[PDB]
Structures are given as structure tokens and as C-alpha cells.
Amino acid sequence: MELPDYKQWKIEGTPLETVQEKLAARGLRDPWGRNEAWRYMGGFANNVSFVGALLKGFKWGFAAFVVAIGAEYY
Template structure:
């Protein structure tokens, strides 16, 4: 059909070496001091790639990604209620007694 995908799948060998990733190199050295080796450390390489963002960027995205849409919908809802006179906040007879 001739359509290009909207993203590029990275080559697998980009995620095969921990060289250049300080946190994982330190982990490997600390394990080596204890005589241990983590054969699955390569499975964590993707977490430290710059394209995935820092921890704070991930937290910001998690909590605030829907903020603009939510704020716009809230403003639209309040404006419609004020314009159309809705809301149903009239006092009832039993509330007036108090």
C-alpha cells in the first residue's frame, strides 16, 4: 500500500551493549566486586536511552498529559451551565427551614 509507518523501529543491536550507560556500568562493577554477574542486564538498557525521557519527564507526562483537555472541558462545562441556567442548585423547602 506504500504507507510508511509513523515511527522507526530501532535496530536490536542498539540495546545489546551497556557501554556508555553510567548507571548500568556502575551496577556491573558493583556486582563484579561481589563475584556476581547479571546476564539479563541488557534487558534494562532501553530504560536509559534518551528517547524515553528522564524520570521526571515520565512523571510529568503521566500526571499532566490530560491537563489541557480536562481544563478546556471544565471551562466549557461551567460556561454552558452559566449560559443555559442549569445546575439544579435551587433550594428546596426543607433546606430553607434551617
């Protein structure tokens, strides 16, 4: 119930959050740093992109293709 605890994220990672370096040529810098970085890390670093999103493994395709091909088969 105390689950939303701090001292947790405090960005290390996130090539999108490395713009703090990009803005360091002017500087702010992060603060407030970790709010938009709340869920920025964790298993949210993968996020499968293009066709592999719409393949979903291409699982049964090339394994089950000949599953009917074929038993007699002449």
C-alpha cells in the first residue's frame, strides 16, 4: 500500500532521456527528472516494432504448412 515509493527510477537508461545531455549545452537539467521517466524503464524497453508486431512469431506458418502436405500424396 506504500508501493509508490521513490528512490527507484532516477534515470539511468533511456536513450530518449539522454537529451538531458543534449540540453546540457544550455541546461536545466532533468528536474523534475523522473516523472516522465516513471514507467520509462522496466519491461517497457522492448516494445516490439514493425512487422514482428504483426507476425507474432510467425509460429504455425512454416511448421504447419505441410502438415496437410501430404499423406497420399498419390
